Amino acid sequence: SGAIYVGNYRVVNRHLATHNDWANLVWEDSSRDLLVSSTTAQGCDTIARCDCQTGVYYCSSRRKHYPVSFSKPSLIFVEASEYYPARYQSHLMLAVGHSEPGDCGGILRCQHGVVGIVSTGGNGLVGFADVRDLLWLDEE
Ligand SMILES: NC(=O)[C@H]1CCC(=O)N(Cc2cccc(Cl)c2)C1
Numbered sequence: 323s324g325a326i327y328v329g330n331y332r333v334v335n336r337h338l339a340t341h342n343d344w345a346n347l348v349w350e351d352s353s354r355d356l357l358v359s360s361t362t363a364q365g366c367d368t369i370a371r372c373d374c375q376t377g378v379y380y381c382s383s384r385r386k387h388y389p390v391s392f393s394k395p396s397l398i399f400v401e402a403s404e405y406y407p408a409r410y411q412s413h414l415m416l417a418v419g420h421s422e423p424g425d426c427g428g429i430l431r432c433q434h435g436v437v438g439i440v441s442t443g444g445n446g447l448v449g450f451a452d453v454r455d456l457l458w459l460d461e462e
């Protein structure tokens with residue numbers, strides 16, 4: 323679990339969104355495993371606007387934050403799970419690191435702010451859904 327709170331927005335993994343999130347839906351994309359809903363209170367996170375390929379992510383299954391190098395956001399094939407059949411997931415970045423399904427939502431950050439959230443994993447790899455291209459998250 324985990325979410326990003328920027329301005330009047332809440333960013334979560336699409337597969338973990340709540341009834342309030344869908345009722346207050348701003349934008350969602352199944353192919354990215356992302357969902358954004360509106361909030362009443364102002365959040366305090368900053369989204370990074372950069373091309374960083376190094377950062378730190380939180381891994382709940384190890385209660386640990388790990389420094390990682392990660393790939394550029396890309397269209398990557400993702401195996402079937404409890405929430406999606408096998409498909410291509412867009413805007414996905416991989417790193418060598420530990421992750422388990424419940425680790426989804428853990429933040430990846432660089433010196434500039436939040437880069438994305440854990441979305442995939444398996445075989446010593448961890449994948450993050452990028453949020454740096456969602457420029458509208460910085461306004462209104
Ligand atoms: N983005 C996806 O398709 C997810 C959907 C939910 C989900 O359980 N997975 C599988 C998964 C396996 C290992 C680590 C992680 Cl973080 C996730 C894939």
Ligand SMILES: [Zn+2]
Binds near residue numbers: 371435
């Ligand atoms: Zn950065």
